[PDB]
Ligand binder design. Sequence first.
Ligand SMILES: *[C@@H]1O[C@H](CO)[C@@H](O[C@@H]2O[C@H](CO)[C@@H](O)[C@H](O)[C@H]2NC(C)=O)[C@H](O)[C@H]1NC(C)=O
Ligand SMILES: *[C@@H]1O[C@H](CO)[C@@H](O[C@@H]2O[C@H](CO)[C@@H](O)[C@H](O)[C@H]2NC(C)=O)[C@H](O)[C@H]1NC(C)=O
Ligand SMILES: *[C@@H]1O[C@H](CO)[C@@H](O[C@@H]2O[C@H](CO)[C@@H](O)[C@H](O)[C@H]2NC(C)=O)[C@H](O)[C@H]1NC(C)=O
Ligand SMILES: *[C@@H]1O[C@H](CO)[C@@H](O)[C@H](O)[C@H]1NC(C)=O
Ligand SMILES: *[C@@H]1O[C@H](CO)[C@@H](O)[C@H](O)[C@H]1NC(C)=O
Ligand SMILES: *[C@@H]1O[C@H](CO)[C@@H](O)[C@H](O)[C@H]1NC(C)=O
Ligand SMILES: *[C@@H]1O[C@H](CO)[C@@H](O)[C@H](O)[C@H]1NC(C)=O
Ligand SMILES: *[C@@H]1O[C@H](CO)[C@@H](O)[C@H](O)[C@H]1NC(C)=O
Lengths: 48, 49, 214, 338, 97, 48, 48
Amino acid sequence: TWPMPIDTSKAEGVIYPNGKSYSNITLTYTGLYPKANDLGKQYLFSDG
Amino acid sequence: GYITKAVDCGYDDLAQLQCSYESFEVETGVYSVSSFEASPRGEFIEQAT
Amino acid sequence: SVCPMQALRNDTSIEDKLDVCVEYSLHGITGRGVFHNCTSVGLRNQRFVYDTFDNLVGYHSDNGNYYCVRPCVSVPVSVIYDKASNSHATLFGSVACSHVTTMMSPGPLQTTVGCAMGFINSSMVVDECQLPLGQSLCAIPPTSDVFQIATLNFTSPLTLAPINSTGFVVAVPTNFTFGVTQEFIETTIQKITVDCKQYVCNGFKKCEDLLKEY
Amino acid sequence: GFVVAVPTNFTFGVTQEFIETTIQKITVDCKQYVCNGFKKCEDLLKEYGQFCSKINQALHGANLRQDESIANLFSSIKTQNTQPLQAGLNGDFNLTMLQIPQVTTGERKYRSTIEDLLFNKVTIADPGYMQGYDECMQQGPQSARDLICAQYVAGYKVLPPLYDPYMEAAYTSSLLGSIAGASWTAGLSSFAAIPFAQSIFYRLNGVGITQQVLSENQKIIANKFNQALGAMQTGFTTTNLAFNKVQDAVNANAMALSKLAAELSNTFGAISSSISDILARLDTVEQEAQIDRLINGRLTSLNAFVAQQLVRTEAAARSAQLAQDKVNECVKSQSKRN
Amino acid sequence: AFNKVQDAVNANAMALSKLAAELSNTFGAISSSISDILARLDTVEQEAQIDRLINGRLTSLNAFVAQQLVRTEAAARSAQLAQDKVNECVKSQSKRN
Amino acid sequence: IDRLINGRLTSLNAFVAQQLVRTEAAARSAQLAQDKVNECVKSQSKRN
Amino acid sequence: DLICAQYVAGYKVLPPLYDPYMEAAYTSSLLGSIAGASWTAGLSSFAA
Ligand SMILES: *[C@@H]1O[C@H](CO)[C@@H](O[C@@H]2O[C@H](CO)[C@@H](O)[C@H](O)[C@H]2NC(C)=O)[C@H](O)[C@H]1NC(C)=O
Ligand SMILES: *[C@@H]1O[C@H](CO)[C@@H](O[C@@H]2O[C@H](CO)[C@@H](O)[C@H](O)[C@H]2NC(C)=O)[C@H](O)[C@H]1NC(C)=O
Ligand SMILES: *[C@@H]1O[C@H](CO)[C@@H](O[C@@H]2O[C@H](CO)[C@@H](O)[C@H](O)[C@H]2NC(C)=O)[C@H](O)[C@H]1NC(C)=O
Ligand SMILES: *[C@@H]1O[C@H](CO)[C@@H](O)[C@H](O)[C@H]1NC(C)=O
Ligand SMILES: *[C@@H]1O[C@H](CO)[C@@H](O)[C@H](O)[C@H]1NC(C)=O
Ligand SMILES: *[C@@H]1O[C@H](CO)[C@@H](O)[C@H](O)[C@H]1NC(C)=O
Ligand SMILES: *[C@@H]1O[C@H](CO)[C@@H](O)[C@H](O)[C@H]1NC(C)=O
Ligand SMILES: *[C@@H]1O[C@H](CO)[C@@H](O)[C@H](O)[C@H]1NC(C)=O
């Protein structure tokens, strides 16, 4: 039961913009993103 | 009502200064004029199969 | 891209037309600009590189090279006019004279503010100018056949040196004149009132009925 | 009688001040700023050429007035009087920070040491007056040397200043050599060549320190002076008001060019700010109404830029007159103003 | 000093020139003349054409008022400098070098 | 709605431009007020 | 006389740097610096 929150300082779970690239800059972008420090939902699987 | 003199505005840079001031007489000075235009020449085209 | 078949032109190359303003159609993307061979930046599978203003700045080509892309640029032009001789000359600012000869369609003279046309090199030194060019350069009109380049240059006149004694040396006047310095101070401007409805609508009742809202 | 608090020990203190004399001179190519090439925009723009002319004429007038103001400030070199100063120490006063380093190498330095210390703490973009166009043509990684390449794309020009660094160095050497002597007496007509140390000791004698005190404390006064002059680069921090005014001036010059370049990405309610995309996506009737939005918005933005530069030029010409008063009353005389 | 006198005269005249030239700005309409708009269009197009001229001319008058405020306050500062010069140079002998 | 947006943004630009001019004018008259304090309140001036 | 239009239109009036106690301290320093305060040539002694 390890909590794994979203760390935006490593850009976790971020979809890259399609059709283009940027180099050595910083900008704002509107899209579909996860919340910062979202724990999410964990799924644990076992052998039978 | 007659036309006694003209200036072709595209002839040189002083003609273009005289046309921008709309006057045959301008003062002594240094003036910035409209730059040399690009007018693109060729074509690059690249595409996929 | 998705393209209709009637808009498909064949193909071209860029390697013989670098550093000039061209048109481009690169995998559906169209525009105008200057291409320069560069070192690869960005991701090469995304094939286009943009800036923060979403303008195209680079392109990864099918031939394997990366190109920096700029918009089309222009050389700045300055005209130097003297009314007494009815003469003129030209300065291309920030341009080296070795590049004026290539895009050309007394010789061109390189100065610290660019490439001058219609000027002769001179050794003249003045301390007063009516046609200054910047960086202590001054243009001298014909009375020769062309304008001259001179320099603004002056320094402090007389350097009295201290004597090696117990007193000192002082320069005391033995003759004089009266000089006049003139000066102007503004105290006022011209006072204006505006009739706003007359300025906007100029008579014309239909404009005034639309202007009742404002 | 009364009670009076009279000093028994002292130091020398330095106050620092910055006065602005000039702004950066800009011209705009109006047709290339509004229409970016593109003949069809220019054919629409021929209805507005009288408004493009007024912009160029207003900027021409402002730059000409600034040149006249700066030439009038530099006018005092040609008539001053000067005494030659020793290199290094003058008596026991050490003036090395304020003098230009005589170098045996192949470079002609025109800055003093404290000027190089002040200039290494500010960041200024190099306009490239001699060959900046050809250096912007070969950029690659554009932010390697701080050039202004937005000039040649957007359609403005940075004009060089009236004087070169040699002449500015000559002006401040004139100011430095006019300190000792320089009308010792009632009028302004005589010029006495008394050396620097004697001049300092007479200035100290005139503010309440007698000749016995000045004779008994000669080396102590010289050491305190050298110690105060050695610590002037400490003031080059952002807690000091004068340094913040120097950086404020550099930023106002940069802010005018940033605000010029950014208005070319305003759509003003069109479908794009790029003219090429409007020409590629619409037909002729829609193209005209789309392009005239960009034309009217860009012309209004140029009018606001011209109105900003006029007020900044007028402010700079008033503060150049204040700097002339400071040079005449603090550097070249003893002011009677508390 | 003479150049400054001529500059002040030109500043007064240039303000009035810029006032008068804006009445020939079409602001993106078919004309700068209201008469021509009323002669060439019907009512629904006349309203959208005249609203461009109204909005443009009101914005221009705002810019003119902003410039007159700055110039009036600058002239009031130099009248104070002029009073200082009359008191210290014409009416006495100053000790300011 | 984009008419209102372009209008209100142009108005805000004019407000900013007037505020910069008033701030600079108040900074010059604060220096004048300092000179008046130093030469008329704290001392006896020799200026007519 | 409140400026309630701050909260409707979207602007904020900022408070001045000093409270009234400090402004009174400034003008009381000015009132107390008048008598004496180097009634002689220089500026570095203080006569009471
Ligand atoms: C001061 O300067 C004036 C101006 O040069 C001298 O006046 C000249 O005197 C000579 C002989 O008396 C005449 O030949 C010149 O014509 C005069 N010049 C003018 C312009 O009138 C004057 O002599 C000088 N005095 C001293 C004491 O040096
Ligand atoms: C005036 O003040 C200075 C600074 O405090 C005194 O200089 C100090 O002198 C002592 C002994 O001579 C030294 O140990 C200190 O290092 C000195 N201080 C500095 C900063 O150099 C000076 O003595 C004082 N003058 C008198 C007459 O008391
Ligand atoms: C006059 O002052 C200068 C600058 O403060 C002194 O030069 C410094 O000397 C020290 C050690 O002697 C060096 O570490 C610095 O690099 C020097 N600075 C410069 C700019 O040269 C100079 O020594 C002083 N003169 C005398 C005679 O002492
Ligand atoms: C990336 O940008 C930074 C600006 O902060 C610059 O210092 C650096 O040199 C750039 N890197 C390259 C490889 O150009
Ligand atoms: C373009 O640049 C690449 C890498 O910088 C280089 O390998 C290539 O030879 C260059 N092209 C030409 C024609 O020199
Ligand atoms: C102009 O003259 C100077 C010296 O007179 C010389 O150093 C310089 O090279 C000359 N320049 C040209 C372009 O002839
Ligand atoms: C100005 O004149 C002096 C006179 O000696 C000379 O040394 C200096 O090099 C000149 N400067 C220029 C820029 O011509
Ligand atoms: C004063 O200086 C000169 C150098 O020009 C020297 O010849 C002379 O001996 C000096 N006087 C004394 C008393 O040292």
